[PDB]
Design a protein around this ligand. Structure first.
Ligand SMILES: Brc1ccc(-n2ccnc2)cc1
Length: 410
């Protein structure tokens, strides 16, 4: 019996920021007066682009007030232009409490769509830049012993450029910024750049800007209290190709970008994905800890190394990572295994949910029960309701259920 996945319209994107669809404006080896202040970096990133144009709505939010999102992007550009004219460029920027920002800050079965599997595939790929330092992984108070060091270095080599790692660091930055603004600017509609930092294959430090968020009032007395925000994210993805994915968004067209491509220079429109969203103290605390995804992935790898190593009465770390009884690597290479474990862990973070919790526990139970049956038989009901009670509309849970059905047919 495969699981019954629900029927209904396709599921929609529900992450706090864009994943495979993000777009970066970047400055290499930055060295401007006041480098390392997000607002300064963001302005310098904005001014690397010359394709801006009069924005318009190209995919409206069917339940929101689309004029207000348009006005909010134009307000960002206007107020950033103001900062540019003040002699001393300030450190933070508190937006005027306009009607459009007041409205936007707040002052059902879905079927599995193909996009979430593509997101996951994109998360496993390598990028052309590194997102962590060599000793990023680990909190150890003492120097780690020799084998632990060797394993960390092999693993880091495999995942440092991974796209899932860019999501970790992106996620860590924006949650840190938003949590700190939530407490330092409680009453302000603070403009918060979405920034990440990486290093090129040639070693050039780069600062990247994905877009902006604007927080609402945030007198967060509890971990579960919510700060609303509006997010505004560049993308080269035309939302008209997969409209169902962008149900929660109003999408503007804001410029045109000249691109290197397999056909040479091409001009492509630049979009801006706009939605209203919210988070809480406790979720922002969790987002600041996303580097733990790296430790948890590493630890799953080390389990496998220790199992093979107990079988051989010998450490198998070199033999494992260099792919020297096992006669192959199902994913194709040791690197893809590491990055797949990572991508799984990061997507558990990015798409956390009660649905994911129930499915994770109740499917482990059904797994072990089906395992003991396949092993102890030839080919020839209640727990099933527990799992499928989590199969409602969440893309990550549905994708994992899809995967579970594949582990059944095999
Ligand atoms: Br910084 C910056 C860069 C561009 C714009 N802008 C305004 C209109 N189009 C682009 C505003 C601020």
């Amino acid at each position: 019996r495969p699981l019954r996945l629900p029927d209904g319209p396709p599921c929609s994107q529900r992450s706090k920021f864009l994943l495979m669809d993000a777009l970066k404006l970047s400055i290499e080896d930055p060295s401007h007066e006041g480098e390392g202040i997000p607002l300064y970096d963001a302005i310098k990133c904005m001014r690397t682009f010359f394709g801006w144009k009069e924005p318009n709505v190209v995919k409206p939010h069917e339940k929101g007030i689309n004029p207000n999102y348009l006005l909010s992007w134009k307000q960002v550009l206007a107020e950033l232009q103001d900062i540019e004219n003040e002699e001393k460029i300030p450190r933070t920027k508190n937006m005027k409490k306009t009607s459009q920002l007041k409205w936007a800050l707040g002052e059902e079965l879905r079927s599995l769509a193909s996009w979430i599997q593509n997101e996951f595939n994109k998360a496993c790929e390598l990028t052309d830049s590194s997102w962590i330092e060599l000793d990023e992984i680990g909190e150890d108070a003492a120097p780690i012993e020799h084998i632990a060091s060797m394993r960390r270095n092999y693993f880091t080599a495999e995942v440092s450029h991974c796209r899932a790692t860019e999501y970790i660091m992106k996620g860590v930055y924006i949650n840190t910024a938003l949590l700190n603004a939530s407490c330092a600017a409680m009453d302000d509609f603070q403009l918060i750049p979405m920034i990440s930092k990486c290093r090129t294959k040639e070693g050039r430090r780069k600062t990247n800007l994905y877009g902006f968020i604007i927080k609402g009032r945030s007198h967060l007395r509890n971990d579960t209290d919510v700060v609303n925000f509006v997010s505004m994210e560049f993308s080269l993805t035309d939302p008209r190709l997969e409209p169902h994915k962008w149900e929660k968004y109003c999408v503007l067209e804001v410029g045109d970008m000249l691109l290197r491509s397999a056909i040479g220079h091409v001009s492509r429109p630049m979009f801006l994905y706009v939605r209203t969203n919210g988070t809480s103290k406790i979720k922002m605390k969790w987002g600041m800890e996303m580097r733990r995804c790296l430790l948890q992935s590493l630890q799953q790898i080390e389990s496998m190394i220790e199992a093979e190593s107990s079988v051989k009465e010998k450490d198998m770390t070199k033999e494992f990572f260099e792919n020297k009884s096992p006669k192959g690597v199902e994913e194709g290479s040791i690197g893809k295994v590491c990055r797949t474990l990572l991508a799984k862990s990061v997507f558990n973070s990015l798409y956390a949910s009660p649905q994911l919790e129930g499915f994770s526990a109740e499917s482990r139970k059904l797994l072990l029960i089906v395992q003991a049956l396949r092993d102890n038989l030839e080919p020839g009901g209640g727990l099933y309701e527990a799992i499928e009670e989590c199969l409602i509309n969440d893309p990550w849970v549905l994708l994992n259920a899809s995967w579970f059905n594949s582990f059944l047919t095999h």
